[PDB]
Amino acid sequence: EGKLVIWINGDKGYNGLAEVGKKFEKDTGIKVTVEHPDKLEEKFPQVAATGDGPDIIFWAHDRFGGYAQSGLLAEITPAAAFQDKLYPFTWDAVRYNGKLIAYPIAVEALSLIYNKDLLPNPPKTWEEIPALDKELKAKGKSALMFNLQEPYFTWPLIAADGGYAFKYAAGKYDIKDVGVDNAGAKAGLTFLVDLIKNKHMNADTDYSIAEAAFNKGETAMTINGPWAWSNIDTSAVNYGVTVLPTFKGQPSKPFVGVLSAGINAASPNKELAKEFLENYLLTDEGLEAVNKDKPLGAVALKSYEEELAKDPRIAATMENAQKGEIMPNIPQMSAFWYAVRTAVINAASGRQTVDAALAAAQTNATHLM
Amino acid sequence: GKLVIWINGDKGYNGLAEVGKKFEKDTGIKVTVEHPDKLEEKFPQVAATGDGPDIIFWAHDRFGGYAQSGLLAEITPAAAFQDKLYPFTWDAVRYNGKLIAYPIAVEALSLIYNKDLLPNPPKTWEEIPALDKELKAKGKSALMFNLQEPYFTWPLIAADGGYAFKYAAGKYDIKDVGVDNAGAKAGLTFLVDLIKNKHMNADTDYSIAEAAFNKGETAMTINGPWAWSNIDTSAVNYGVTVLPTFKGQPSKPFVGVLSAGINAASPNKELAKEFLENYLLTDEGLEAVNKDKPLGAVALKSYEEELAKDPRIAATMENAQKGEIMPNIPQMSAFWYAVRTAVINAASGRQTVDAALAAAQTNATH
């Protein structure tokens, strides 16, 4: 019953795509049918939900937003290693309401096309076109002709100095929507409290107790960060560092801290700062110099991370970071931490149930704003 | 000219100074690396009188507060530079849709395990109770970590859908159309002026422009990869390049990304993913399609690097990176229709620039 029906426009290389289909079939036994029906982008929303639509549709990204609005497309979830194989801006094109809803294939935009016999070296600027046209008109030619009837062609110029269709409103933390009190949080906290109730952990275990027990070889596992590594290195323990365990088949989501270099808005040296950071520091040699002095852990620069991640501990830090959440960069985090500290302690000890501790934390977090 | 850099005393500040010294050797500009106590508290105190360091190093989360006070300069790296760092690290230094710092390093909790006690650690939290029973029979325990601090316990709590504050995704704002602002008027006025001064004709359309270029009557045109084959058939030896700037800013062509979507109702979603990821989005897969009918520039970096040996493709990609992604919402239909009318009417004598854009603003909205 497994098969793939693929829709692509008749002006694309659908025979080429079929050849890829045939390779798939040869490897998997699964038959791939490539079709190019007329009006396929109109037909798709008509048939897709009924159980007679294609499995895969190829079209320009802009139409997929409308499809996504109707819930016609499956959220895709490629691994980080796969996402990194495509240009970031192409993933931006297939994002809707913060979800990836397609795979990017190809990229098209307008360019400046010029006659090399008439103009061996074309102009850099729009402003130089009037004079260039005067010069060419003296030989009975013109500088520039393009389609003025269709805004697609004239928009690039119009947009240049601040024209736009729709303002993209940036993503934002919503401080009135706290998630300490939902089903997911209750499940995780209940598992934790149950580990305590069942005597697999003690409620009063803290940083030092855990560190000592691990470094003295009394416990098989601990949860900690790169700051703890050197203390373990000096111990007798042969340790590894790995991805955190899943809970209900989902990754554990540690908060991620990103050591960042900000440029003072009042600095008269902003161009120097940019030059230093981009071209001296954020290079393999620059990060190496810093790392050698005191380890950075995992780094944001791909080329150097690929070198550092030969150490599995660094690889694991990065893997956990990619599965985690970026620490929110807002003042209200203080209220969250305080409320949550209390909730876990009270649940861990039996002073409150899980539901009442999280309920109280939800109300405290919001009220402390 | 100089650079004073602040970084915490627990970081590799001597290493950073060595980088500073290399900068000085090349530029003649001295870099001073300092690690004052409480530097993250000091910065908003002295930056806000305007006498602080030029560069400050700290964890990204503190920079949100700084950015709220306008203490940090918006950074604008080129596309080629942004691509050198992991996307998610740029997300960490974004505030109100602006990049406010450069990401350096990445820190997170991991599972640390004793290889002599446990050569292969558990993949699941659920398997820990049984593992602990087994280890307790030898006088050991499975797992000990800091239960007092939510930083350490949150990973588990978050796993099944706990979160601090809902991040509401970025979104096109349909009540905010920008066809009628100073920038749009500037661009359109320059265009109308090209017409008024007889450097272009109001009536020029796709076919007229294509014919004139392909017959060697005009030095330049603006067009996409779809037009190339018709030029190839002409006598004209052509090049393809980056669009001209206007007021020293890039022309921003709309970018179309040919995309493959998976039907939400499909019972074959895992097959689709396998086909797309591991057969199609590879060099050999894209080559098969490309050989049949050219794709132009491609999203797959490894194959784009091969295709971009053709300067025309390189130029398409360069323009695409400087352009704007075509908004993926239905309301674009209203924008195009309104704007089509505005440009035609301004280009002709039929309306002024201001009145044509004003009418288009009102037509787009609704």
Residue numbers in the entry:
A (entry chain B): 5 to 373
B (entry chain A): 6 to 371
Article sentences:
To understand the molecular basis for the observed dimerization, we crystallized the protein fractions corresponding to the dimeric species of MBPeng-KFLFAK and of MBPeng-KFLPYK2. Both fusion proteins crystallized under several conditions. Those of MBPeng-KFLFAK belonged to space group P1 and diffracted to a maximum resolution of 2.0 Å. During model rebuilding and refinement, it became apparent that adjacent MBP molecules formed the same intricately interlaced arm-exchange dimers in both MBPeng-KFLFAK and MBPeng-KFLPYK2 crystals, (harbouring two and three dimers per ASU, respectively). Instead of a tight β-turn at residues 173–176, the protein chains adopted an extended β-strand structure, crossing straight into the second MBP structure for both MBPeng-FAKKFL and MBPeng-KFLPYK2. This β-strand pairing is stabilized by six intermolecular backbone hydrogen bonds between residues 171 and 178 of both chains. Because MBP’s polypeptide chain goes back and forth between its N-terminal and C-terminal lobes, this chain crossing resulted in highly intertwined dimers, where the two domains of both MBP molecules are constituted by both polypeptide chains. This structural architecture produced an extremely high contact surface between both chains (~11,300 Å2), corresponding to a calculated solvation free energy gain (∆iG) of −174.5 kcal/mol. Following structural refinement, clear electron density was only found for the Asn-Ala linker and the first (in the KFLPYK2 crystal) or the first five (KFLFAK) passenger protein residues. The Tm of MBPeng-KFLFAK monomer (60.1 ± 0.43 °C) and dimer (59.0 ± 0.49 °C) were lower than MBPeng alone, demonstrating that these particular passenger sequences further destabilized the fusion protein.
